[PDB]
Ligand binder design. Structure first.
Ligand code: HEM
Ligand SMILES: Cc1ccc(N)c[n+]1C
Length: 292
């Protein structure tokens, strides 16, 4: 019912946002030690997802538009524990480019992270506008990890995502790790990765998974190679419809990249009305492509 119309930051164009992208990317390169040398890429992807994943298609509450993660109710959501690291990373970027909206910054952080981690290009649109503290969605809109495929499927209908979009998005769980103090899940340690590939799907299909209890007394799936999956991750191979799609992405890197790009852009744009004369989506060059 609420309408959020994208409004381009005054006078700004592609080159302005490429500069912001570049600053994020240069800081990703510089701050390499974070989380035992994983770096900030994975947490920035999770931040972009969590600021977007509060959306409810029924009333257009939540979503990335309003930048409401900057308000304490949302930044203190138990579901967001650990994301303060990503926010702190983005603070000096926002100070350098104070003209960018909070939603644009948080979402751009995720795009930049995916691309700099050698993921697909993610087209990105500007024009999110900060909204007041009373527009902050209540806690409890982000998903639980201890549930089954039916829970996941129903959960993602609220975000207008179908089976293929859900399975594609979940491939982000190749990135980074779980931290017991944040979520009650732990790992991987030495098997953690900061390069974007389709390995989530290959690992689901090819590892010898054991259902174990962690030190927080929660169940998770662990392999002898040191990989781990949440119950919701493992549900993608328990449900026959999800399983077919897992097999598809395990066997086609390009298809996975293309589907993830579309689903991730969609996620980041849910709730936003783009005027018919809005700029086209921007596709930012990586530092590597720029020789930087
Ligand atoms: C059923 C849906 C999902 C559930 C239950 C879930 C749950 C979790 C949990 C519990 C963690 C660990 C947090 C921590 O301990 O630091 C995590 C991490 C992560 N999630 Fe998800 N997630 C879901 C979907 C997604 C989606 C759609 C994306 C993005 C496309 C995403 C991206 C990430 C990333 C990149 C990390 C690693 C963060 C880091 O290394 O600091 N997740 N997720
Ligand atoms: C939920 C999650 C996040 C990161 C990684 N690497 C694995 N999993 C299962």
């Amino acid at each position: 019912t609420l309408v959020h119309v994208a409004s381009v930051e005054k006078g700004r164009s592609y080159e302005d946002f490429q500069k912001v992208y570049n600053a994020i990317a240069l800081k990703l390169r510089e701050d390499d030690e974070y989380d035992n040398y994983i770096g900030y890429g994975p947490v920035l992807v999770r931040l972009a997802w969590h600021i977007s994943g509060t959306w409810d298609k029924h009333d257009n509450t939540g979503g990335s538009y309003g930048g409401t993660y900057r308000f304490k109710k949302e930044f203190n959501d138990p579901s967001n524990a650990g994301l303060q690291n990503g926010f702190k990373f983005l603070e000096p970027i926002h100070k350098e480019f104070p003209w960018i909206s909070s939603g644009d910054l948080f979402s751009l952080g995720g795009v930049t992270a995916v691309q700099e981690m050698q993921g697909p290009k993610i087209p990105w649109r500007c024009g999110r506008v900060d909204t007041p503290e009373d527009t902050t969605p209540d806690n409890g809109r982000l998903p639980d990890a201890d549930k089954d495929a039916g829970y996941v499927r129903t959960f993602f209908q609220r975000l207008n995502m179908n089976d293929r979009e859900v399975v594609a998005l979940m491939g982000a769980h190749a990135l980074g790790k779980t931290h017991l103090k944040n979520s009650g899940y732990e790992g991987p340690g030495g098997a953690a990765n900061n390069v974007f590939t389709n390995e989530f799907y290959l690992n689901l299909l090819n590892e010898d998974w054991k259902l174990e209890k962690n030190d927080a007394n929660n169940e998770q799936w662990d392999s002898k190679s040191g990989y781990m999956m949440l119950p919701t991750d493992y549900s993608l191979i328990q449900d026959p419809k999800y399983l077919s799609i897992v097999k598809e992405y395990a066997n086609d890197q390009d298809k996975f990249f293309k589907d993830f790009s579309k689903a991730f852009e969609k996620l980041l744009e849910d709730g936003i009305t783009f005027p018919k004369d809005a700029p086209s989506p921007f596709i930012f060059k990586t530092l590597e492509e720029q020789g930087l």
